[model samples]
Target: EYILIDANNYHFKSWIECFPDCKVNLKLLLFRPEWFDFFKYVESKTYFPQLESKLSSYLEKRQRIVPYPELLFNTMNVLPPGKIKVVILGQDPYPGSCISGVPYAMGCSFSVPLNCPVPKSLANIYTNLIKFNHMRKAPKHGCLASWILQGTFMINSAFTTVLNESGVHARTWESFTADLIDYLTDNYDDLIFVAWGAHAHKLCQRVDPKKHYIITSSHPSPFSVSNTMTSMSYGPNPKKVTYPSFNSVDHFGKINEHLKSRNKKPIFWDL
Candidate 1:
């Protein structure tokens, strides 16, 4: 009686019984088939196999995770393999269950829904857009899905982290992250890789930079964007500060400049 044959025939829950590692890839086949090709290296690579094991292992655990099952693949779901032009790497999802799992985005749709608050990182991102990238206004909501749809591949170095804490899953994603970027650097041409912090930079560093553009900055967190909280000034007491904070790097602006130099269109980055 269960002759399910068409597309959209599978559900995440249906795979729950035996997602058992081997079956995890099966879930990627159609339930959200768009990313199946991206994971093509999983079979041959040692790290890729490890990633699958760890991912499914964690899913079976009782801990609550952010960017839950529904939005786990939200990044790849919106991005087509060919459409990817600029890749923006984040440390991790912002650790809020209510928010979209898709890195900087706070909501699932194209824009932040009216209910969610604009993440601090998003505004710091907007500040660069206005200050250096020629943006006219910053919207009240933070939804970077628009950028993702525009070929800005925004993803966390660690796809899912423990809610309220950090980097619990970072180790789990190491090789898979760079391995994916390694594949991209070889197959894709002149793509931009934006790394916004320590972890993101490490991930970006593993790939060959000659084949791609890799941009980096401290992070868009409020402190890093403006200035560090601990002012290690100079001469005895130390309390000096100026405006050349992390925001001075102007990441959003430089991405397009690199794009245009290489003959790709510069992204507007509004919203």
Candidate 2:
């Protein structure tokens, strides 16, 4: 597997090495001097009541909540550098999953219903994968823990910048894609980009096609098996590429074998 941030190795390494403290520095860059003006501009255009609350809460909490040292510690424990090749991109945080309090998933303090598309179904798959198959559950307090321990980052629909400017639901797909491209640009040439379903697919596709390779797959819902079947119709050589599946162990084994046979080239979208 290729390192997700290979291009920005120095920056990412330095950032990770100096973590919780580094987040303060990142906040300054993400929330620039014009951020207040940007917030007002987005607020003026806001129409939904729930979005208003969500935006307000994030800003208020952002300034008040100091970065949790333990959370940072957990993240570092989970991911190191060069260990993450697979990236999961979801629209927004899942609402009420107890373990959803990480950066890209849910808030640190609040519990909201998982309003995301196909949440119930997706949760079922994840629960089974972790509980029955022995995959680790991405923790609520720090999904970054898993990524950090594993040495990768999970990109979400809206991160700090989005929270500062507008709520997750308020931003258009175009806006979110732009932010995503800037962060992952040049950094993740060899990483696998996993979009849940067609909704996520539209958003993820807006990124610059040249910078990174993506493994487009059907969402892992049981219903999405039909979609996966459709994707398999125009299949290329199985020896070189594979897809994510319920059978996690076998799937990854196939991926490793494929990588070895391919002469050390990083495999894109191995399931």
Candidate 3:
């Protein structure tokens, strides 16, 4: 006779049984072997119960689920092992239909129309990309699939968020996110860690500074740009704010420089 003592184990096992397709889809989506291992490890952990509870509670209480739920795993799905050149850390998923379901990324797939207005933070990002000469013109759609293909892992600290709430699920995801950061730190070589704002900066301590380039900047949010002393913006306003301005173009140049030093081709930032 087998006795099950952990409620989480039972809950997760039942969840897996009910969502058998998730296992199949997840396996197919996770291109890297390590990512599959990461998913398995997270499921095994006791904290999964809390994470599951928070997501379920959000679903029960809210009238609408966060947009692009089908692509919740896209962040890890897109980044393959040994292919990552840079890591752009973000806080969480945006709530509405504006999200592309990738961290800090926005836009629908190729099949969808590209009429959605880009989020403000992402608009700032585009401004910096042009200022840095990465692109001659801002992209009409915020789809970041091109970046992922080029090894820019846009990972969010919290994979998902409640509708209209920015950090509601952070506590549930903290440990899992830390584990992911640790996995990248230990397994990868010569990574570029882009830490934008406080939430992203906290994960920087886990990265080995000696082996990688760590670029820190303020969140592109207007509030952070205006209020935080360390925030950076490249808008036309030109009025000096209290904080030091961040030059994304310069930071991107450094990233390319480091890659070239190692005989790696520079990232094609056109997208």
Per-candidate TM equals 0.74, 0.43, 0.74
Pairs of residues clashing in candidate 3: 229-243
Q: Which numbered prediction scores highest in lDDT against the true structure?
A: 3
Tens digits of lDDT, candidate 3, 1-271: 0111111221112222333433222343244464777778777878766666665565445323332343455656656657889888877766554343322223122111235456767777777777877778887765566667788777667766655655666777798789888888887788998777776766777777667777776777766643344432233343543333344336567788889999997788785
A best-first ranking of the candidates according to their lDDT comes to 3, 1, 2
Assess candidate 2 and give its lDDT. 0.37
Would you list the C-alpha lDDT of every candidate in the order shown?
A: 0.59, 0.37, 0.60
**How far off is residue 260 in model 1, in Å?**
2.4
**lDDT by residue (tens digit), candidate 2, 10-102:** 122222233433223322223223233333443454342444344345444543221222221222123332455545554443333123222
* Residue ranges of candidate 1 with Cα displaced over 4 Å: 1-26, 29-35, 47-50, 98-114, 227-245
TM-score between candidate 1 and the true structure: 0.74
